[PDB]
C-alpha cells in the first residue's frame, strides 16, 4: 500500500487514540466482496486487509456502485477506503471488466474522485501493483455517498474519531 | 501605553480537523503565548523585587 | 470535470469547483477550453493593506 | 459550490479587502451566456452568481 498523505492520516488517528471498528451493512450487489491475495496470508491462507474489502467482477459483469450511507450518530466517522492501481490493461479487463475505472467519493461538504493509474512499479513481495489509502471524515448529519464503476476497495465500517491527550511516539526503549 | 499592533495573522481557532498544516498552526501559536506568559511572568517579579527594595 | 454523483442540497445533486488566477502587470491570461467552464465575467482589484477577516458574534 | 483550497482563498482576499469588480468584454462567440439555475433564486427569478457566467450549448 501507499498512503498519498502519510503524516495527515497519521497524525489525526494518533490524536484521536482509539480503533472502535464498528461494521456497517452495505449494499455491494452485483459484485463479489472478500478478495483475498497471496502477498497478505493470514493462518496460512490467502486473506487481505481486515477493515477493507476487496471488490472484484461477478459472472464478467460490474454493474456501477451506488451506495450511500448515512450519519445518523452524534459522532465524527472516520471511514479508510482504497483505490486500486493494477499493472496491466489485461489484468483490469480481468479484474474489473472495464478498462476505465473511477472512483468517486463525495459528501455534502466535499468531494474526492481519484482515478486509477495503471502502470508497473518495483516488485515488493513478487506483487507489482499499489493501493492508494483516502480518508473521509463524515459530520453528524452528513451523507456519504460512494459511486465508482471499478477499481475500489470498499471499507466495511467506520472509524470513531474522538479528541484527547492521545499522541504517537518513536523510540526503542 | 508601549503597544505593537499587528493586523493580519494566521487563523488560531480551527472547526474542521485537517492534518499536517493545522497542527503546526496550533503549535507556532501556542510557542508564542507560552513564551509570553513566562515574559509577563519574569518582568513583573523582577519590577517588584526591585520595587520593594529601592522602598 | 469529474461527472459522479453527491449528496443533495437545496435539490442540486451537482457541484462547482473554484479556482482563482492572478495576472501580473504585463502578462497575458488565456483561458481554453471546450466545455463545462464557469467563465468569469471580470477582474477583482487586489492590494496590500492592513486588512483582515474575524469571526465573531458581537 | 466547493472551493479546493478554501483557506488560501479567504486569506488573500481578506488581506486586500476590497472588492472592486470591473466589468470586461470577452468573446465567448458560438455559446449561450448568463446560464440560469433553479437553486439560485434572485428577485423570485432564476439566477446564478453575479461574478460568474454559466456557458451552455448553442
Ligand atoms: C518492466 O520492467 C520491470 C522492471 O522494474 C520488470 O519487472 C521485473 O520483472 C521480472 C520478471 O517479470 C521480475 O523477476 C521476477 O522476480 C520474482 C521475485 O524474485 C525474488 O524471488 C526469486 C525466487 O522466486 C529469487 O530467485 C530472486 O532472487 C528474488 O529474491 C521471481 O519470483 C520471478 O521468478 C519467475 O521467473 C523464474 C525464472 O527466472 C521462474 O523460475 C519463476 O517460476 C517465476 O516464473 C522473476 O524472476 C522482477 O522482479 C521485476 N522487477 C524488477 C525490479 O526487475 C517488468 O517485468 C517489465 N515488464 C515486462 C513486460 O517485462
Ligand atoms: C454514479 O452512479 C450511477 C448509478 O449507477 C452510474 O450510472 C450508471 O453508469 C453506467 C456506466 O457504465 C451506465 O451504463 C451505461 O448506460 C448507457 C446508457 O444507455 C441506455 O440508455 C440509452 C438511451 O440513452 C439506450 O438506448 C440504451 O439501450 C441503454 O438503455 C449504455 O449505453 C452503456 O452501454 C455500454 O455498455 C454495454 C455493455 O453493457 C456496451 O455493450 C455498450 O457498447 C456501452 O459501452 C452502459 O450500459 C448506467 O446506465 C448508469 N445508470 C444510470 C441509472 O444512469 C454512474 O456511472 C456513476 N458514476 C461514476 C463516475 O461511476
Ligand atoms: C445514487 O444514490 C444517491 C444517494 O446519495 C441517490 O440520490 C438520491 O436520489 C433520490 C431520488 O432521486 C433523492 O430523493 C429526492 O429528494 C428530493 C429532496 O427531498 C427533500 O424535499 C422533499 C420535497 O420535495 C421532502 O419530502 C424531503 O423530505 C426532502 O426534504 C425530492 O424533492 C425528490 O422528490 C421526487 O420524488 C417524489 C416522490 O418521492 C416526487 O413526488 C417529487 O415530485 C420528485 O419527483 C426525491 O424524493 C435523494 O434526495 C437523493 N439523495 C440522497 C442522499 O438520498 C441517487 O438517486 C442514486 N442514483 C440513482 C440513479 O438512483
Ligand atoms: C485550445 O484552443 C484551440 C482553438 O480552438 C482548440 O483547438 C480546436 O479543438 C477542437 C477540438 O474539438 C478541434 O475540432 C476538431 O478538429 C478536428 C480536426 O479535423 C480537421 O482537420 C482534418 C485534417 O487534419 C480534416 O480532415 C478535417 O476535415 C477537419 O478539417 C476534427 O477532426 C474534429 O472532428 C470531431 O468532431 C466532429 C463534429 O464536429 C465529429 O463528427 C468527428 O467525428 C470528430 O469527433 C473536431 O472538429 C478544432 O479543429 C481545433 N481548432 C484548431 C484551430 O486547431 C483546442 O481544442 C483547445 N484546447 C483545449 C484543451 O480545449
Ligand atoms: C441494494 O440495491 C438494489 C439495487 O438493485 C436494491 O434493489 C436493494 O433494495 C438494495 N438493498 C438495500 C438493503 O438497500
Ligand atoms: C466476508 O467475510 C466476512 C468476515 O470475514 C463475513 O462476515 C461476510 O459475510 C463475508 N461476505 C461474503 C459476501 O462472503
Ligand atoms: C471573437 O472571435 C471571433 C472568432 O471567430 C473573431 O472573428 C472575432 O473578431 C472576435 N471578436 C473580438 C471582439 O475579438
Ligand atoms: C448577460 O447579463 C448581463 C447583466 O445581467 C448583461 O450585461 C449582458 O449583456 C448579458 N449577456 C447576454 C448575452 O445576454
Redesign the interface.
Known amino acids: 500500500y501507499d498512503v498519498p498523505?502519510y503524516?495527515?492520516?497519521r497524525?489525526?488517528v494518533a490524536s484521536s487514540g482509539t480503533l472502535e471498528f464498528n461494521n456497517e451493512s452495505f449494499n455491494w450487489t452485483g459484485v463479489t466482496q472478500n478478495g483475498t491475495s497471496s502477498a497478505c496470508i493470514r493462518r496460512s491462507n490467502n486473506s487481505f486487509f481486515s477493515r477493507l474489502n476487496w471488490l472484484t467482477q461477478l459472472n464478467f459483469k460490474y454493474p456501477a456502485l451506488?451506495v450511500?450511507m448515512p450519519n445518523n450518530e452524534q459522532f465524527?466517522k472516520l471511514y479508510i477506503w482504497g483505490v486500486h492501481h493494477p499493472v496491466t490493461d489485461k489484468d483490469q479487463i480481468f479484474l474489473y471488466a472495464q478498462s476505465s475505472g473511477?472512483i468517486?467519493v463525495?459528501?455534502?461538504?466535499?468531494?474526492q474522485?481519484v482515478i486509477p493509474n495503471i502502470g508497473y512499479r518495483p516488485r515488493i513481495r513478487n506483487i507489482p501493483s499499489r493501493i492508494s489509502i483516502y480518508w473521509t471524515?463524515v459530520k453528524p448529519g452528513?451523507?456519504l455517498?460512494i459511486?465508482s464503476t471499478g477499481n475500489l476497495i470498499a471499507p466495511r465500517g467506520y472509524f470513531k474519531?474522538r479528541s484527547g491527550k492521545s499522541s504517537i511516539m518513536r523510540s526503542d526503549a | 501605553g508601549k503597544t505593537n499592533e499587528k493586523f493580519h495573522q494566521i487563523e488560531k481557532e480551527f472547526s474542521?480537523?485537517?492534518?499536517?498544516i493545522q497542527?503546526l498552526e496550533k503549535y507556532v501559536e501556542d510557542t508564542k503565548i507560552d513564551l509570553w506568559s513566562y515574559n509577563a511572568e519574569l518582568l513583573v517579579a523582577l519590577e517588584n523585587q526591585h520595587t520593594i527594595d529601592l522602598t
Open positions: 498523505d503524516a495527515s492520516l497524525s489525526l451506488n450511500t465524527d473511477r468517486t463525495s459528501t455534502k461538504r466535499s468531494q474522485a471524515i452528513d451523507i455517498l459511486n474519531i | 474542521e480537523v485537517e492534518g499536517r497542527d
